[PDB]
Design a protein around this ligand. Structure first.
Ligand SMILES: CCCCCCCCCCCCCCCCCC(=O)OC[C@H](COP(=O)([O-])OCC(O)COP(=O)([O-])OC[C@@H](COC(=O)CCCCCCCCCCCCCCCCC)OC(=O)CCCCCCCCCCCCCCCCC)OC(=O)CCCCCCCCCCCCCCCCC
Ligand SMILES: CCCCCCCCCCCCCCCCCC(=O)OC[C@H](COP(=O)([O-])OCC(O)COP(=O)([O-])OC[C@@H](COC(=O)CCCCCCCCCCCCCCCCC)OC(=O)CCCCCCCCCCCCCCCCC)OC(=O)CCCCCCCCCCCCCCCCC
Ligand SMILES: CCCCCCCCCCCCCCCCCC(=O)OC[C@H](COP(=O)([O-])OCC(O)COP(=O)([O-])OC[C@@H](COC(=O)CCCCCCCCCCCCCCCCC)OC(=O)CCCCCCCCCCCCCCCCC)OC(=O)CCCCCCCCCCCCCCCCC
Ligand SMILES: CCCCCCCC/C=C/CCCCCCCC(=O)OC[C@H](COP(=O)(O)OCCN)OC(=O)CCCCCCC/C=C/CCCCCCCC
Ligand SMILES: CCCCCCCCCCCCO[C@@H]1O[C@H](CO)[C@@H](O[C@H]2O[C@H](CO)[C@@H](O)[C@H](O)[C@H]2O)[C@H](O)[C@H]1O
Lengths: 63, 97, 104, 108, 59, 51, 94, 110, 69, 60, 60
């Protein structure tokens, strides 16, 4: 049991390292996809950007 | 997400309706966070509290004065004798002597 | 007086929690969020052929998350919106020209 | 009229209920191996937990750890000021008004 | 059924259990969609209380 | 071990003194570690109170 | 007190015994953690899992509360902000 | 450079498990530029910093989001934090012991 | 013991959640009000602090609620 | 009010308007045979079918 | 309400109309020197000079 436990300790250490790095790579993958989507979206912004002063849609009178 | 005025557990806290408050605390919080333990409190010492051990305290000592006694005493049989009639044990174990 | 006070309080609360409605009158928005919301309100949500299929999936997931947080089950437009985005998920591996006929 | 209250119920020990405490129990004291383990890990350069890193990769939105005087005691705090959205028209509802009494489509 | 239109607090007292179960199912689905798992430790020395007892296997 | 002990503590009174000093040192070091862990636990309790 | 058989010498002896006992404890735990532990790794993994779970539940609750507040945009009337005999402001999202 | 450094690090990893490399790559790959960066210092501890032009997207009073390394264990810091929390709570009743096991020792048990 | 060593992601039912919050409330009250005791928190101790001139009066009768008939 | 951890338990709820304080009493000791076990007859044990008598008529 | 043989003691009096429930608190621990011992300064220890804040404005 002691031999098995020594081997298992080594294996578990390596596995913990691999698991952490794998989860972080998955995180990075998702964030890079989000960045690609944002890069495509910024092309649809009109020239000069948005008029942040006014409402985009004016949906009623102001009398 | 269907009955908002009737489901108060899934509603924001009254500090959220108030419009007034390095990193700041969040402005919006639900009452459904009451159903979680480690929502607001931290998870510190979460897996290390079942590791604080204390030993037992029983002492197995009792003086044995046999000079006081001169008669034998009865004693239990704890297990059946398998060193004798081993082959027949399943066949006679159900009987009474 | 009571209505004025109540509605100013609502406006200040919504400004505090950074809300945006059908009248896009919020300056603190990200340009990407604003484009997405204006697509959902005014334009046509659609995935571009420039993107890779994974990024198309991500865009559709973003649309669905945003729209489901915005519209509740009592909302009438929820079912049509979810159906259209489900059709986009069905037709990710396609061009816009072929996707229009099916999602129109 | 709540603080410094009087004894309201009696205190007692039922006959022959056990106590499980020996006579040296007052000299007994507790101990945890956690401090020693931390020192040994730091000295031998053993694998650290990710709670030593303030950034949080366990979600898509940005979180930063806030520490209470020690790396063992932390809470993640979100950084985004989240934008919220409502696919709702304004001024279409007056809940204080009873609508079953008014004549019209909204009332029906 | 509990008439939450007229007794909302009384009805929420009855229905928050199903809200809690939905809250659990949400995470169980997210963790099945996004593969989230953990390193399970080796089996304990006294996993079985008695040698003749069966150790019913659980997923 | 018995040789090393009797060489330095040949008499009963000295043996008792050494035993008591050993006990006190053990208790003191345990108290140091316990104080550290107690400070951590106190912080967690204070955060529970804050909640 | 340094060498001779004396009460200070015995006190020093007991102190040394205590420190050697704790050195032995240090050795025991060092060898255990270096060669005889998987519980730390398993618990670390489980705690990372718990963090993910926590943040998921947090975000979900926040979304639900946000939907509750979004249900009030229908009640919001920006015309009531108007002052009598004055024009309406685009500040309140016409 | 960020991609190459990340690839090199993840095969011979740091006790940090390459977290700074990961976040650096994530912030470089943004279109308009990094929102979050690591401040360059003569001071010993580095800090996480937020750009000003994206400060309105984050719930922060300032740009300093704190140190990029966790605190070091210290009795004094723990005492300080506990005292601050006690002062903020202001609860009369903390430390009150209504019954103590009768003993010559001041703290029986602990 | 249920989460980290048995593998249960949801260890506490609604009852256990209520018990946890009950104990949290009791801790808060015990630290807020000095000397609080049984009727408000499950706790009994003998060495109590009394004013010095302790008056003893009868409780008022229970409030008459309106009822039909 | 219902909870035993409320001081005004089994007391009528207080409103801004004047309201009759005679309370609905649930069936705590029902008979053994409750021949109609439909929802129609069961709901009367916990709520009044016509609603509560605490409604306002606002002057403004 | 004032009497200890009342259950709602030190609680505001209930009226048909809505009224602020913050109560007038008499001076229970007055200072030793009360330089003005005229009725003007004494009455403030048991009543408010401007009257109580529980008055109605009836809609009808
Ligand atoms: C009818 C049936 C017949 C059939 C039998 C069937 C049964 C068969 C199965 C067997 C039974 C199993 C049943 C299940 C067991 C589970 C129940 C259980 O164990 O716990 C229950 C029960 C529950 O207690 P608890 O509240 O739960 O607390 C549990 C604690 O863990 C433990 O409690 P504690 O730790 O608090 O109590 C220990 C106690 C007692 O501790 C001890 O006694 C330790 C043992 C030492 C014994 C040897 C010393 C003898 C000395 C004798 C000399 C006296 C002078 C001579 C005078 C002669 C003239 C009379 O401590 C003290 O009182 C203080 C003493 C401190 C000093 C002791 C150490 C120094 C020893 C040297 C003395 C020097 C003094 C110097 C003073 C300083 C001066 C500078 O446990 C106990 O109470 C333990 C003590 C019980 C003692 C019983 C008293 C009767 C003993 C005689 C038994 C019969 C004798 C038979 C003949 C043989 C003798 C002649
Ligand atoms: C009136 C009489 C006068 C009295 C005088 C008293 C004052 C004089 C000083 C004596 C004071 C008594 C000290 C008692 C021990 C400390 C107190 C205590 O027990 O606390 C509980 C505490 C329990 O630890 P825990 O982790 O919290 O929980 C334990 C559970 O078992 C954890 O559960 P688990 O699932 O993790 O299981 C893990 C377990 C797993 O264990 C196993 O798997 C099997 C264990 C090994 C079995 C053997 C297999 C063969 C391989 C090993 C080879 C060993 C033999 C060498 C063979 C050579 C050929 C290869 O690991 C162990 O527990 C190993 C324990 C360490 C055993 C090895 C240490 C050396 C033993 C010899 C010491 C003799 C002292 C004599 C004192 C004189 C008394 C008159 O004990 C310890 O901290 C471990 C002891 C570490 C060593 C301390 C040594 C320094 C302190 C004593 C000073 C004197 C030593 C002088 C050196 C002598 C040369 C050897
Ligand atoms: C006739 C028999 C002989 C009578 C004498 C027996 C007693 C000898 C001891 C006397 C000295 C006691 C100390 C007094 C100073 C004040 C302290 C104190 O009071 O606290 C102890 C205790 C109160 O505890 P407390 O209120 O919590 O105070 C703080 C703690 O106690 C203390 O703080 P802590 O909790 O932090 O300390 C914990 C720890 C600290 O201490 C320790 O850890 C170690 C202690 C054990 C030391 C071991 C010995 C050292 C050995 C070293 C040498 C080894 C090698 C050589 C020897 C090898 C062995 C062969 O352990 C202890 O302190 C245990 C204390 C043991 C108490 C005495 C237990 C015996 C109870 C009375 C038995 C009566 C027998 C029947 C009488 C029949 C007569 C008709 O009070 C008593 O023990 C009362 C003793 C009264 C003696 C009564 C004598 C009978 C007289 C007849 C009267 C008739 C009316 C009686 C009713 C029924 C009649 C039919
Ligand atoms: C308060 C000041 C104390 C000053 C010293 C005065 C003498 C008091 C002595 C009382 C205890 C003497 C026991 C001797 C054995 C001690 C061995 C020991 O300490 O090992 C530790 C060990 C516990 O280890 P763990 O907590 O599981 O883990 C530790 C890992 N760090 O200690 C114990 O178990 C203590 C309890 C067992 C001993 C009890 C023996 C019965 C007591 C009778 C003897 C007491 C005599 C002392 C009284 C004074 C007059 C002689
Ligand atoms: C001054 C001299 C000091 C000498 C120091 C001596 C060091 C002795 C250290 C032995 C520690 C072994 O510790 C113990 O070993 C066994 C296997 O061997 C481990 O393994 C055991 O339990 C775990 C699960 O609980 C599993 O691996 C498995 O079920 C079982 O084999 C234990 O988890 C561990 O608690």
């Amino acid at each position: 049991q002691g031999i098995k436990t020594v081997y298992a300790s080594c294996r578990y250490r390596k596995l913990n390292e691999r698991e952490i790095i794998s989860d972080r790579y998955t995180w990075l993958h998702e964030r890079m996809l989000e960045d690609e989507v944002e890069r495509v979206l910024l092309e649809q912004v009109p020239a000069g950007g948005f008029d942040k002063t006014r409402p985009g849609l004016l949906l009623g009178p102001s009398t | 997400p269907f009955m908002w005025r009737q489901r108060a557990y899934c509603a924001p806290v009254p500090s959220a309706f108030a419009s007034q408050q390095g990193v700041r605390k969040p402005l919006l919080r639900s009452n459904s966070e009451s159903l979680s333990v480690f929502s607001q409190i931290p998870d510190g010492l979460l897996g290390h509290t079942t590791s604080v051990t204390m030993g037992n305290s029983d002492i197995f000592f009792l003086p044995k004065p046999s000079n006081l006694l001169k008669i034998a005493l009865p004693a239990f049989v704890f297990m059946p004798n398998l060193t004798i009639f081993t082959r027949a044990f399943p066949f006679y174990a159900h009987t009474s002597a | 007086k009571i209505l004025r006070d109540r509605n100013i309080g609502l406006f200040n609360l919504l400004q505090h929690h950074n809300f945006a409605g059908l009248s896009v009158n919020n300056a603190k928005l990200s340009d990407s969020q604003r484009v997405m919301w204006t697509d959902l309100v005014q334009g046509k949500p659609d995935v571009e052929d420039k993107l890779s299929v994974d990024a198309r999936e991500m865009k559709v997931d973003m649309y669905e998350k945003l729209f489901k947080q915005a519209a509740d089950l009592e909302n009438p437009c929820r079912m049509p919106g979810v159906a259209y985005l489900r059709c986009l998920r069905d037709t990710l591996t396609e061009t816009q020209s072929a996707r229009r006929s099916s999602c129109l | 009229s709540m603080d410094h209250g009087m004894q309201y119920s009696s205190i007692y020990w039922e006959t022959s209920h056990r106590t499980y405490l020996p006579f040296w129990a007052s000299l007994t004291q507790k101990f945890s191996w956690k401090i020693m383990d931390d020192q040994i890990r730091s000295f031998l350069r053993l694998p650290k937990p990710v709670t030593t890193e303030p950034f949080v990769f366990s979600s898509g939105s940005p979180y930063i750890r806030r520490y209470f005087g020690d790396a063992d005691i932390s809470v993640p705090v979100p950084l985004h000021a989240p934008a919220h959205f409502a696919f709702v028209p304004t001024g279409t509802v007056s809940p204080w008004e009873e609508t079953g009494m008014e004549t019209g489509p909204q009332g029906a | 059924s509990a008439q939450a239109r007229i007794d909302p607090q009384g009805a929420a007292t009855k229905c928050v259990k199903w809200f809690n179960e939905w809250r659990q199912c949400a995470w169980d689905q997210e963790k099945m969609v996004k593969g989230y798992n953990y390193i399970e430790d080796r089996r304990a020395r006294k996993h079985k209380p008695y040698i003749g007892a069966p150790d019913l296997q659980y997923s | 071990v018995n040789a090393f002990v009797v060489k330095h503590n040949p008499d009963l009174r000295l043996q008792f003194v050494a035993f008591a000093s050993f006990i006190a040192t053990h208790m003191a070091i345990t108290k140091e570690f316990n104080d550290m862990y107690q400070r951590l636990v106190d912080i967690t309790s204070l955060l529970e109170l804050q909640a | 007190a340094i060498k001779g058989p004396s009460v200070p010498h015995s006190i020093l002896f007991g102190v040394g015994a205590g420190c050697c006992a704790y050195a032995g404890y240090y050795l025991y735990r060092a060898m255990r953690l270096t060669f005889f532990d998987t519980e730390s790794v398993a618990l670390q993994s489980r705690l990372r899992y718990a963090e993910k779970q926590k943040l998921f539940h947090q975000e979900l609750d926040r979304e639900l509360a946000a939907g509750h507040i979004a249900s009030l945009v229908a009640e919001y009337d920006p015309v009531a902000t108007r002052l009598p005999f004055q024009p309406m402001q685009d500040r309140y999202r016409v | 450079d960020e991609g190459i450094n990340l690839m090199k690090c993840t095969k011979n990893p740091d006790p940090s498990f390459c977290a700074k490399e990961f976040v650096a790559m994530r912030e470089c790959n943004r279109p308009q530029g990094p929102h979050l960066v690591l401040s360059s210092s003569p001071s010993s501890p580095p800090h996480y910093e937020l750009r000003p032009e994206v400060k309105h997207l984050y719930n922060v009073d300032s740009t300093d989001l704190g140190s990029a390394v966790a605190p070091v264990r210290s009795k004094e810091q723990l005492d300080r934090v506990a005292d601050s929390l006690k002062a903020d709570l202001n609860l009369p009743g903390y430390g009150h012991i209504p019954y103590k096991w009768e003993s010559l020792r001041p703290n029986p048990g602990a | 013991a249920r989460y980290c060593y048995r593998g249960l992601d949801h260890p506490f039912t609604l009852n256990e959640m209520k018990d946890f919050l009950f104990k949290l409330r009791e801790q808060y009250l015990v630290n807020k009000y000095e000397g609080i005791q049984f009727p408000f928190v499950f706790r009994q101790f003998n060495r109590v602090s009394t004013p010095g001139t302790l008056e003893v009066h009868t409780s008022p009768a229970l409030q008459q609620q309106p009822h039909f008939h | 009010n219902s909870s035993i951890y409320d001081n005004r338990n089994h007391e009528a709820v207080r409103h801004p308007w004047s309201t009759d304080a005679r309370t609905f009493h649930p069936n705590d000791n029902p008979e053994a045979d409750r021949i109609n076990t439909q929802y129609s007859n069961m709901v009367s044990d916990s709520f009044p079918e016509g609603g509560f008598s605490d409604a306002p008529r606002f002057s403004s």
